[PDB]
Amino acid sequence: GAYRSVGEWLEAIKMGRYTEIFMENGYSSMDAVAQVTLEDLRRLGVTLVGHQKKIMSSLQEMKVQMVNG
Amino acid sequence: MCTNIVYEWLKALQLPQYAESFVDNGYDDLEVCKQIGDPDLDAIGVLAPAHRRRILEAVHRLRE
Structure with a gap:
């Protein structure tokens, strides 16, 4: 919930290399990503x-x- | 509150210098380390042949 984009979330966990792949394949907002x-x-x-x-x-x-907050 | 097990393992292999890269790439316990092959070492950045061979030999031993 505290990340503006999937790219920013990925870079925070040192997984920025996957940003393009997530955006191109339709996992493109933080809401789309939660069902992965x-x-x-x-x-x-x-x-x-x-x-x-x-x-x-x-x-x-x-x-x-999110469940705890 | 307890030593990271991947740190401890790499210490035992006398390759402690890679522990932080292992953990940062998600190889943070011995169950994950058991699955390591050449692509994993590449991503972690273990490049010296002797060190690669030593870790893969260690990985083989975890799977016994």
Whole structure:
């Protein structure tokens, strides 16, 4: 909830390399990104397991902040 | 409140200098490290052949 764009969120978790890929494939606002699954990541070309973990862990961290707030 | 396990592991391999890059790339526990191959080392930035071989040999040992 505290990021202006998907690009800004990705750069905050050191995953900025995926920004273009997310925007081009239609995961283009913070709302679109919250429904992303591990399979969605795989189909977007995020095949490195550590990067999948980074991204899925952050998506979950952001959900936790929202349910708790 | 407890040492990061990937730091501890790389210390045991006498390659502690990569620990922060491992963790920053999401290789933050031994379950993830078990899946490491050449693309993962490339992204992390482990380039010296001896170090690459040492980590991949270690990864093989985690999968036993």
